[PDB]
Structure formats: structure tokens, C-alpha cells
């Protein structure tokens, strides 16, 4: 059927078969220039890589490594979307009736990688599937499955990593060690199209993590790191970033001293520590390590004392023996602080707060949940997802290159020097839309931003708003209802604070809810059509209700 596609679409009367010559014109029609020229150069590298062209000796008379060659082909195919079809035919021509035993194998490797990193256009898809269908029984199903995967999970944003080239010769699946905050590391099977959403799902099913919202996948190399989220990014395309960093640093592409952590980035505005035990355990560890390192850094001593005391209850209980306490404190407190004063004053203060608060003498889970809740309150900014955003038009946010950190407390705009310029509660967020621009409207000021992640950052806020909205038991009245002889109805004025009395704002399927009026104190029936639910989980202050009018 690829014969029929060539007969119909091949522009220069090009051979449907193998050629050992350059190409004077591209196989398909390209109205755009550059695409036209790129098609021919790509072709030159495909051939030089399959051995069908001699590689030069120390335009393209220039040499390159076969790795550099692959990167060239796949690279053009990603950056320029049209060539994606042309290139496939280019590797089909050379793989149809290729009688050199090695050239065939190299071509099919090139389909392994290219079918790893991008899709065909809609028009050409089925034909490619048929040509793969009559493949060698070795790579035949391999490439079909790689194409199904890639077609599902999107276009890779990077050319194949060295690790993938290995996987292609192996025709296998890739093992990857993911470090949990416990220090134990779960090894996961991964292919080219693997996504941090998928990987996090696998970690969940592995350690049984039911409350997964906010667990992200971080990647660390060479005293630098970034996040893959639980979102739709491809970790192979992070590993490629790391490789192209290591080659920049001079080490080998296969040197690869990178690592993947499974870490808690988010805290949801509805976060309940007592909901999941597993989450509480991983994020307990993550917290304590963070205190050891100085990531999570205390502003007041009593808080640190209380954390250490809790930790002792978790590891010790109501037994106070300074042989155990003076043993734990050096390991928990960071070096910088533990050196600041004597272990006698340290064990004495930890045991002091221990005796004071623990008078109940509480499951260890309870104390761990307590310290998780403590963390969530103390460090809203360190538990935020960070984005880079550049302001275009707004007042009160003068900066034009900024860092937006979204977290459970709200949106926070950050100075390049880390001072917070503008805070926003989600109750104050009147809309956030992506166009690569972003339109943020608050209750008072409207802004416009250009950030690359804008879609994502408009999505996350949406996820947080809807979340709150479904849990919101608070509402404001829109129109009035004057009281009647009917005492079933609830009186209210415009802008009243209606509390909706164990109606989660989720239940809007019904058109009636009952509640009480915060001003009146009267309690009665309200039409759900007169309610505007406020996305807060605590009673909204007068300050917030004056703005909402």
C-alpha cells in the first residue's frame, strides 16, 4: 500500500524503491522552502547512516557520529512537523527492496527510533502501519507498538537519548531506578513514550499510594535539577537534556550521572494528612531529610524543638532516656545548627517540649500527620510548583521577568531575588486563561503574562479552583428574597454570606439547598440558582466579602 501512496504522492517521479544516489528533489510536495531543502539534507544523512552513501574524510561534506546523525534526522522531524511524513517515506524507499543485509537492519533501527520520537501525519498513518506490518518478525511488532505508544502519548520534544539507542539494539524495555523519599528506590519499566503521569501511577500501584495528588517526579544531575511533574512530560526527554548537558561538561553521553526522585511538590488546598497513611509516611521522611539538609529552614527555635520532640515520640515514645535522645538529635538537626550549642541543652530542650506536649503519652501516625500538617503550614513557598513568567500588562506587579509559585495557600509572584511581589488567594482569582500568553483576572486588577508553561499554569489553578468549589460550603447571595408568610423560605439581601449547612457545593444537581444566613442568623431554604459558591475551605473574612460584592 506504500507503493500506492508513492505512486500517488511522490513528486519528482522518484523511485518507490531503494536508491544509492542523493535526491535532487524531495519525495513529497512541500510548499514551504527550508522544508524542501531540509528534506534533501535529512535524506543525505539517512543514506550516510545506512551505509548507502560513503561518509566523508577529514553543504554536507561534513562528518558526524552515527549518534549525531540520528539526532539530526529525528531533530528535523520534531522541530519541522511537515518533514515527519517525508522522512518516513525516505526510510521506506530505502527499506523497500534493500538487498544489502546490513543496510536493511540500520534502516529498521532508524524506524525504531523515529517511531519512538514522533508520529506520522493523519493522511499517511495507515500506510505506514501496513509497511510495518510486513516487517521482519523481530522488529515488526516492536515498531507497531512504538508507534501506538507515540501516537497516544504525544510527540517527544527531544531526539533519542543514548539510553534509547541501547534499548533499540536490545529491542527491550528500559529499567529505571526511582528514588523514594524513604531512601529505598523502586525500579520501573519504561519505554520511549513513558510519561511522568504514567511513572507516578506505577509508583502509586507499587507503594499503594491512594492520595497521589501533588506527588511529582524530579530529575537531578550535576548540581542542577528540575521537575517533570505528575504531568505529561517524557522522562526520556529529560534524560536527553541531561546527556546534552554532560557532553557540554565534557563527560560521556553514556556517563549519565542523573537520578530520578519521587517527591512531594504540591500541597492541595484541601489536604488532609489523616486521609492516607502511605502519603504521610513518605512525606514525613521527605520532611525530616529536608530538615537535616536545610532545604526546609526554620525561622523560630520552638518549632524545631517541637519537630524533634515529635520525631522522638515516633521513634521512642513516652520513654525519655538521653542516651537515645542525645543519639537521635545529631542525626536529625542539621550540622550547622547542632554545632551551635551543646548536646546537653539540645537533648534537654527536646525532652522538655516532649514531656510538655505529650501528656497523653497518640498513635505514631498521629504525630507524623501532625508534623506533616506543621510542614504544610510553615513552608507554603517551598511546597509550591514554580513557573517562569514575564509580565506584559499589569499594575502592582512592576517586574517584567518573574517566578510564579502556585501552592495550597494561593498564587505567589516572586522576585528574581526571591522577595514576594504579589499574593493572591484562589477566592480572589476571577479567571486564568491561556491563548503563548496568559490572562489573569482578579477581583480588582487584570493582568497579561507571557510564560511557556501558561497552559499548565492555567490548568493547575483550575484544578485547585474546581477542587475548592466542590468542597465549598460557603456562598454569597446574588439577588434578594424578601421574607414571606412562608417561614420555609430563607430571607437574604444581595451579597449576603450564606453558609450552606452540610451541602457540599458539589451537590448542584439539585436546585434547592438549605442553610443559614450569616448576617440574619435565620435558617431556611435557598434556591441553588441564587448561590455563588466561594472557593474557600474556611469562613471568608469581611475583607474578602467586601471585595466579592
Amino acid at each position: 500500500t506504500f507503493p500506492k501512496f508513492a505512486v500517488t504522492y511522490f513528486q519528482k517521479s522518484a523511485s518507490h524503491t531503494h536508491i544509492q544516489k542523493p535526491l535532487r528533489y524531495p519525495l513529497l510536495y512541500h510548499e514551504n522552502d527550508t522544508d524542501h531543502s531540509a528534506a534533501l539534507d535529512v535524506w543525505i544523512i539517512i543514506l550516510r547512516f545506512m551505509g548507502d552513501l560513503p561518509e566523508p574524510v577529514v553543504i554536507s561534506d561534513r562528518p558526524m557520529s552515527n549518534l549525531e546523525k540520528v539526532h539530526f534526522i529525528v531533530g528535523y522531524a520534531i522541530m519541522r512537523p511537515g518533514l515527519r511524513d517525508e522522512i518516513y517515506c525516505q526510510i521506506c524507499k530505502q527499506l523497500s527492496e534493500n538487498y544489502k543485509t546490513s543496510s536493511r537492519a540500520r534502516g529498521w533501527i532508524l524506524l525504531s527510533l523515529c517511531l519512538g520520537c514522533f508520529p506520522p501525519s493523519e493522511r499517511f498513518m495507515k500506510y505506514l502501519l501496513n509497511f510495518i506490518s510486513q516487517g521482519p518478525p523481530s522488529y515488526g511488532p516492536f515498531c507497531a507498538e512504538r508507534l501506538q505508544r507515540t501516537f497516544a502519548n504525544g510527540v517527544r520534544a527531544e531526539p533519542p537519548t543514548w539510553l534509547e539507542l541501547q534499548a533499540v539494539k536490545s529491542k527491550k524495555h528500559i529499567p529505571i531506578q526511582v528514588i523514594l523519599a524513604t531512601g529505598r528506590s523502586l525500579t520501573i519499566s519504561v519505554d520511549s513514550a513513558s510519561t511522568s503521569r504514567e511513572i507516578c501511577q506505577h509508583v502509586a500501584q507499587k507503594q499503594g499510594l491512594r492520595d497521589n495528588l501533588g506527588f511529582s517526579l524530579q530529575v537531578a544531575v550535576y548540581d542542577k535539577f528540575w521537575s517533570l511533574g505528575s504531568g505529561c512530560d517524557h522522562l526520556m526527554d529529560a534524560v536527553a537534556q541531561c546527556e546534552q548537558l554532560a557532553r557540554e561538561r565534557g563527560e560521556s553521553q553514556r556517563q549519565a550521572p542523573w537520578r530520578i526522585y519521587f517527591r512531594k511538590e504540591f500541597f492541595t488546598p484541601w489536604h488532609d494528612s489523616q486521609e492516607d497513611p502511605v502519603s504521610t509516611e513518605l512525606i514525613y521522611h521527605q520532611v525530616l531529610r529536608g530538615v537535616w539538609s536545610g532545604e526546609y529552614n526554620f525561622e523560630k527555635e520552638e518549632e524545631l524543638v517541637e519537630l524533634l520532640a515529635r520525631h522522638c515520640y515516633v521513634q521512642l515514645g513516652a520513654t525519655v532516656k538521653s542516651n537515645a535522645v542525645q543519639e537521635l538529635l545529631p542525626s536529625c538537626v542539621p550540622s550547622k545548627l547542632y554545632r551551635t550549642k551543646s548536646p546537653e541543652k539540645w537533648a534537654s530542650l527536646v525532652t522538655a517540649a516532649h514531656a510538655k506536649a505529650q501528656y497523653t503519652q497518640a498513635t505514631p501516625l498521629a504525630v507524623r500527620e501532625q508534623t506533616v500538617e506543621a510542614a504544610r503550614l510553615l513552608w507554603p513557598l517551598l511546597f509550591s510548583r514554580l513557573f517562569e513568567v514575564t509580565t506584559l500588562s499589569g499594575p502592582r506587579l512592576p517586574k517584567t521577568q518573574l517566578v510564579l509559585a502556585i501552592n495550597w495557600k494561593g498564587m505567589y509572584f516572586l522576585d528574581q531575588k526571591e522577595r514576594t511581589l504579589l499574593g493572591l488567594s484562589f477566592a480572589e482569582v476571577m479567571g486564568l486563561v491561556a491563548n503563548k500568553k496568559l490572562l489573569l483576572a482578579t477581583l480588582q486588577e487584570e493582568y497579561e503574562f507571557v510564560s511557556p508553561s501558561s497552559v499548565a499554569i492555567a490548568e493547575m489553578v483550575a484544578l485547585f479552583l474546581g477542587g475548592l468549589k466542590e468542597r465549598s460550603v460557603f456562598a454569597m447571595a446574588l439577588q434578594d428574597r424578601r421574607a414571606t408568610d412562608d417561614i420555609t423560605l430563607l430571607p437574604f439581601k444581595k451579597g449576603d454570606l450564606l453558609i450552606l449547612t452540610k451541602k457540599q457545593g458539589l451537590l448542584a444537581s439539585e436546585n434547592w439547598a438549605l442553610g443559614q444566613n450569616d448576617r440574619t442568623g435565620k435558617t431556611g431554604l435557598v434556591p441553588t440558582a441564587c448561590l455563588y459558591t466561594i472557593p474557600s475551605v474556611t469562613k471568608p473574612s469581611t475583607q474578602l466579602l467586601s471585595l466579592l460584592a
Binding site: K224, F225, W226, S227, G294, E295, L382, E418, P452
Partner: peptide, 13 residues
């Protein structure tokens, strides 16, 4: 700071 997480290195955008 926020951008520098001790033990993981520096972020990137």
C-alpha cells in the same frame, strides 16, 4: 532560597 533546594541542586526553567 526557594530556587536552590539543598541536596537537589538548583532548579531550571
Amino acid at each position: 532560597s526557594i530556587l536552590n533546594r539543598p541536596g537537589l541542586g538548583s532548579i531550571v526553567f
